[PDB]
Design a binder for these strands. Structure first.
Length: 132
DNA sequence: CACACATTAGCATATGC
DNA sequence: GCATATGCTAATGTGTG
């Protein structure tokens, strides 16, 4: 309910503190990584300050940023111190929608991609083709 | 675990200060 | 040139067999 407006107020104040402290969003991600271990990319911080992320994600990243703004105020010095593969895989589709792992290993060795990368890309290919 | 589908979060490049 | 906003899709995660 009002959690929406409370998040929005927190985000506006967060933008104000970030601009006042002279930290870029990539620097914010680096600080989050070096103070918690879960380094985040600057796109996530952008979508946060612009309030683009989903509600569950909104709540999930609220506490980390709360802690960073409540902690970093003390001292800053120590804290500071490809398309052809796509086309080939599309060619591999239209004939065998769900290949076996035996074929997956061959595909991975053929195009030089990691087995897990090819497996997840295959799953998401199926996913977006089953959207429609 | 793993995978069926939903969420999530980082990349390449597009804009902007 | 660096720093933000977008489109887009690897990657995980919920939930499960």
């Amino acid at each position: 309910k009002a959690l929406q407006k409370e998040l929005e107020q927190f985000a506006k104040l967060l933008k104000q503190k970030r601009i006042t402290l002279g930290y870029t969003q990539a620097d914010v991600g680096l600080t989050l990584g070096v103070l918690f271990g879960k380094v985040f990319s600057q796109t996530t911080i952008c979508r946060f300050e612009a309030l683009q992320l989903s509600f569950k994600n909104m709540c999930k990243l609220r506490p980390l940023l709360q802690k960073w703004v409540e902690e970093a105020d003390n001292n800053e010095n120590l804290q500071e111190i490809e398309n052809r593969v796509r086309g080939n895989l599309e060619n591999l589709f239209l004939q065998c929608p769900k290949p076996t792992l035996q074929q997956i290993s061959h595909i991975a060795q053929q195009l030089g991609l990691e087995k897990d990368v090819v497996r997840v890309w295959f799953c998401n290919r199926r996913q977006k083709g089953k959207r429609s």
